[model samples]
Target chain A: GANKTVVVTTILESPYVMMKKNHEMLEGNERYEGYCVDLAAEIAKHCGFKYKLTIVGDGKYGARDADTKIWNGMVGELVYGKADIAIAPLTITLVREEVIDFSKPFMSLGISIMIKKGTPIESAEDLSKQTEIAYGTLDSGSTKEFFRRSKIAVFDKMWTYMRSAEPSVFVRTTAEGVARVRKSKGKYAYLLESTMNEYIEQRKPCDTMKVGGNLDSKGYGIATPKGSSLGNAVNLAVLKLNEQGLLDKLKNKWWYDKGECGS
Target chain B: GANKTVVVTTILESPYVMMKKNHEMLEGNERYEGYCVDLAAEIAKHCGFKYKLTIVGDGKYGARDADTKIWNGMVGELVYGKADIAIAPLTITLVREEVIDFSKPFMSLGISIMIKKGTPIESAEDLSKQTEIAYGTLDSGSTKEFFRRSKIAVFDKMWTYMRSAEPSVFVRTTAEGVARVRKSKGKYAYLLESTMNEYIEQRKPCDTMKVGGNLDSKGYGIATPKGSSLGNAVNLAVLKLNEQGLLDKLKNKWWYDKGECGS
Candidate 1:
């Protein structure tokens, strides 16, 4: 087990994982770089393992099909023995936890509202009460699932509208959701995780802002197949990293130090 | 297993668990009341089990002896089979996790700075850089252990100062630490979990406040002995409650709805 290079299944999300500019000239793990890339290095070093980074073939975070009962994306890889671990902004959820194991959160975030500057909405309630401004979350992701399953009156109401909205408010990727916000001239609002929303608020153009507080609180964890031997060491390593402040340091390095928006 | 009445281990902490004023006349579970009391009832209902709440024999949160390697407190109860589960504001830490299973965080918090309303210090960096304002955390808890084991410069520096501070900087309990800060006339700061700090800030005499960002982030989880059968269902219940917004509602019911301090 120690001799085998751990296969890490991850997704390409800005600030978490991205292709290097000179990626065509690079090889293997070196072709990718970002927060999760750096995090993967630290985790491997601490856990004393060798690893390889492979992007999820389906380009999805991971979700199970309701009809087929089949999991897809990084989660599927772990469930099917295609990968040894997953290191990315994978949100730890009950549905996911049943099939896989997660370390204590390496980082905490929540579902949040991202809006074009000057949007009239102040909170989810504000959005739910109005019809002029449209809002939706990334398709096949936790944010959308949250609204879909929420029993809270306001969230349930919002979900009903989003499920039937004209032109289908859902987007395939976070970037697409954000681009829709930028082009809709305040008509479109995207619901994404706060980590990404905060990152985008600091990027070029800076015409967007995270309004109101997070809709829910959760975290991303290093995941492994159920009962994997690597689980214990990796979980301890995440705590060590958090205790040492390395997680916060990495967040700053990627989200702020490289920030394009004015300080 | 379904026929057994599960025994829950907990600690007596304000707002989370407390003796009823009429405790001397009440029987069994009716002797207690608070957030954890309500949470335990909900957990049992969802899991379809009968249970009883018993406070830990010792007041310590849970720690292992350096020389004997023995765990004491609610953690010890679970490890030694004295309790079936723990439902309280028990933090989920790596060391404790090694001996127990924790549900995904039912609540999230971080090590925080609690100060009198007018403390000159603004952050942990400020506390580390100066000696006039003393600081410490609850003894035998994760906060102190964090400082004791930290490799980060600021926390390590703060630990060094706290370890040998004149007249002992550490307090035996959260209430003791809060009292020390209130009576020390802004000369002392108590480092405790944000959950407790926020609770105290809302009580009468509202003279203390949680300042600066949290030093580190973590969460409180429902805990069971390692590999316990109850762990799976309880963990899912926590995630379900969070998704339904019950956790937030319970928090508001305890912390704000009955707040002594004005809104």
Candidate 2:
């Protein structure tokens, strides 16, 4: 059984989801181009449905407002029944899973540190123990939350330093932090998700590197309103895509095919 | 500071470490051919050390004997100073970290389910709730211990189901478990490391497939005695290999160039 039109809410994230440069000439889903665009098309085809791809108006990847107890961004759209599904670079976290359903992850990723070439840093342990090269994270995201809630001895200490470092180190966006890293020569290192890190590393200039092992591991999943009729179909579709190698193909199409940096 | 001959300990596992088809024609390390063999050579070159690759006498990747409190396998060899370093498909776990040092993981993997083609099983959750299909773990490996000590709800319930299942569902080796999956005609499933599962999925007799995302996230690393002089060098070597794309190349050589399955 296919729906007349499944409303999918996505976010504006490079490589994962993005507006085609000449979108003014196009309409609806065709106006978008990137990994998630391709992914949504495949999901719709696999599940036997048509969909309307709408960008989340808030421009955030869903964060709960601590004071209001209201979710914002794509997650909020799903929670409030504003969207039928969310197909984007939305990470699957335990908190989000309690409020909505996520298909099996379409991609796996983790938090990693990005450094300018020849940064003399090999691991997070190095940054945590030194003041020579200053570091920070995205202002508000799971990576920041990870450091804030960490209890691991070294991480706890690192968090303490990050929380009260003399100069406020957090940046408002991944691009801001990445630009800071590029402009600061070797003074600033940025912590962000590896998916974005790897994507940016493959883009122009190629002066940045995703260094060391990720601090943690998680996945990005297609999301739906809790108990929605489309959840099982999307889940099965993602799994089938995963099994058939479409996910890997889509990844290479976006990340590596036109990669500016050599493998 | 390099040793005259680094005593590298390894285990025989398909694709990672293995005895060559015509072992009688070769001697010492030359008798082995696989991904790890190539990795060891690369690591040795980068670290400026000549290594004598020796197989672990116990033929185990390492596990602690709860009753005796003795670590067995390659981990034991490192802790007991019988091997200078370990470079095999040995997973890095928290418990082992307490006794031995591990390089940043050379590879990432998780526990995955291997089922014959057309099996009704789709996910671990599916198998956990049904008795129509029989499943088991490698008799003695990290996968078994993962179930034994799992605290996660679904896995805990799964462990309960697996621990008490009849007719000794556990198999003595991965090969045995794989054979069981092929011969059982969808009656049995084997839960093992994803690296091995993915490798088998690509080999001859492609009637089996690795379904679903892995149950947990983990990695494989080089193990060394706590104070071994080679630890830092090995760690740095791994980072170099990872950065230079050698690891990905090796994976392709072993898992894909000879792959029997359609990508």
Candidate 3:
């Protein structure tokens, strides 16, 4: 338990991980900076462990493909023994739990829609009932998955509608969806995790704001391979951070301090 | 715990509770039939208790009205001591947990869409991207609640659309929405819980089917007023029934055996 290197896996979703603005200025882990960087520092300090940061090979979150039987992104890295732990904005879910374990949530978020100011659309229900506005999910994760199974009849009906709409409604990246919403003006909206939405809101061209409420409640947890020795200590680390209010402080630092909205 | 008759409160929803076909001849509990009726009987037998079942005066599952700051439905009955326990499809959520205790889930369900045969829709994604099909949630409960606070961006976008849809797509009851789906042909769809949707599919005029898959995972629990003595016994009873395969047997008996759709 002393000084063992924890190979931490992560993704480059903004506010979590980003390249240092200075080109080729730093080496190894120093080349990257963001919330996760600082978080890893704090967590490793608390647990008295040494660590190395590794970005996921594939940019996607881990998802098992139907035909290839492969898991892509950071999730796969951890599952295949290429990494010892993951400290990114990974969600805790039943499917993922079958293969790995997650610590208590270090951060909480849910799906949120982004719309231009003064846009007519006000809630997700409206988008479901009518077709005036075009909307789509950006990439994979739980957003589209919810609609795919859509545990309720209302959403199930909506799910059916989404599946049939041609020319496809989904986008490949968060930027693509955001750009679509901006270009469409009042006619389009983008859906994504609230944490990312909140972060984007604080950035440039502040015309977009989170509309309605969150679609559901979820949190990101520090994850480890199933039955990893680090799971207990990492879980306790998050609990301790929450207790000491450091998690709140971290959010204020990352999300608000750099607010381009000038709030 | 032995002699005093336990006062139980429940809600009236199809398959969970309903008046018997021969209602005028039967008295008290005998007047009731359906899932909860059988569940209560089995639970009582296991716990060695005599109980009286009373329907909730307010026909809601349990929700806090933001305006009135009052809890309504079966939840209120238990909170105010009008009932010793609640036996129905009440969902165990964080908001409800603040006021009551719940047993392990006696049943599990998720969101499902009900559609008439031959519709262009298939998944919620199709609906969000187009406008030909109209959809809405019936009444209040977690159905609309999920979309309202759907924390994901895609869902949050939909939530905004739903919250603002003009002509107000939401109906007052599941039956109303079902009727709309039938009358509108493939133009309308109903969003509701999978259990209820499946039940409706089994009813007469079985043109409607649960489309796609459930949106999310959820379950129903037997709830008790917080700090009530019955909490432990009721929890134990549910676990025992589950271990004994009695829960599955009861579902087959009520949902399939008695189904009107002709197997």
Candidate 4:
């Protein structure tokens, strides 16, 4: 392999490092263009790594599978040495933190609720007080786990109730619930980050909207193997970009300019 | 006062229900579009209450102020009877589910992770096994709570590691983490939801991707006052639309149809 290229294993997702249909025609950082793409190029240039993007095998980023503890997705990509680094929108949870090394975050977002029109729901308190509207989250995800352990007022109570429900409302993916809302007579709602909720709103024929302030605030970071030599470089780049005004420009270009800044 | 039309206090988000620059010239449900708009019309028709749409005074949706138990946004609208119903993407978390009676899941999604495109992280195991690559989640949201309580092997251990951290690796929001990942060489990562992870990948200059699988699962629901006569009708309509395949269609028309399905 004289033309050796570094394998940058990533998830096959939008606004990320997707394998372009015209990828063969693209070269260098130009192949990377989305928010993450731009960030990756900036990073690769900073860290001195030549790489090719690849999507992870499974759709998950971090988990402690009840059945098996083996990690998958980008986490696996790094563990198995399939990739040297990750610049995806992968979250940093306590569970994930212990397994791999991540840099500082560049953004903040919280879990949000998405419902159809004409629903009487308003806040987390409202859901906690009702019974007929049994609530559950997408299965095997961070949201479900939140309910599994939440202790604060309304959330604490709601979690206790949902965990005990016989026919759980938990679903498989965010898209499933979004579909339910559009076609299912307006019975179901979806919970996710405000970022996604607003993105959907901009989508044509969108049937979802983000409601309420984010339940929690968190950041997105780059990741690497525990002792990767490139760690410090990545962290500094994140901070530098923030101070240079590139971050704010990105926000307007993506959140507002995209017509997806729904609250 | 007798001649006044019903005013529905709501937020002015696009797609769901942006007051068209020329709302005075609009009429009927046609005056609205997108999922929430259409769903709102259906629910209003089902509920049998005539109303006109009005944006909320403040851009915020709902929140429990530290000073009062009272709510804000649509929650305030309902508490004050400023609006008969809300057809927004309200989440029915265990907390909110308690206060309002939701119909069924309108959509399903969970918190997920996003990373810059080159972090060598994939699953939690990778992070747990190493110390150099430190990571954490968003603060004060569903993700932090999910790990705080999850009993799963990796997660349970992760909770201890994160909870035990001195300053805490948990960042404040997705935006912060995303920015961190871009600027940092690769020291941080984020924990967020799939809806958002997916959207970030779609934005311009996108450089992120969701990793592994979602940590847990859950669904969003349509909600209403428990005693409202329109609950059953609205619930049934949601189911009907779902069965007709309209829900799935909308998703593609909006988010997932990027012609990259095969990717």
Q: Please rank every candidate by TM-score, starting with the best.
A: 1, 2, 3, 4
**TM-scores for every candidate against the unseen true structure:** 0.97, 0.55, 0.53, 0.46
Q: Could you give candidate 1's per-residue lDDT for residues B27-133 as a string of tens digits?
A: 99999999999999999999999999998999777899989999998899998999999998988888898899998898999999999999988899999999998
Interface RMSD after interface superposition, each candidate: 1.3, 15.5, 12.5, 20.2
lDDT of 3 by residue, B1-263 (tens): 23799898987777888899899999999999989999999989989999998999988778888998788889988888889999998866656766887765677677778889888777766666655677778668877877775655555666676667766778876778788888886887778888888888888888888888666555577999987878767876875675445776788788888788885
- DockQ, per model, reads 0.69, 0.02, 0.02, 0.01
Write one digit per residue (lDDT tens) for candidate 4, span A1-263.
35355566566445555556787898754555566777776677766667776666777666665678777778777776777778777765555656676765655456778777666677667777886555557775556666565555667787777777666666676666666666645555666666667666665565556677666654566888767766656766764564344655675565567664343
User: What interface RMSD does candidate 2 have?
Assistant: 15.5
All models, RMSD in angstroms: 1.6, 18.4, 15.8, 24.6
Rank by lDDT, descending? Answer: 1, 2, 3, 4
TM-score of 1: 0.97
Q: Who is ahead in DockQ, 1 or 2?
A: 1
Best by TM-score: 1
TM-score of chain A of 1: 0.98
Judged by DockQ cut-offs, the docking class of candidate 1 is medium
Q: What digit string (tens of lDDT, one per residue) describes model 1 on residues A1-263?
A: 23889999999999899999999999999999999999999999999988999989988777899899999989999999999999999999989998998888988899999999999998999999987999998888788889998888999999999988998999989889989999999999999999999999998788999999999988999999999999999998998787778998999999999788887
Tens-digit lDDT string for candidate 2 (A1-263):
53378899997778877788899999988888889989999999988888999989987777788899999889999999999999988877656766887765678788899999989998899999898788999877678877887666666787888888868889987789989999988999998999999998998889999999887766688999987988867876875675455677788899899999987
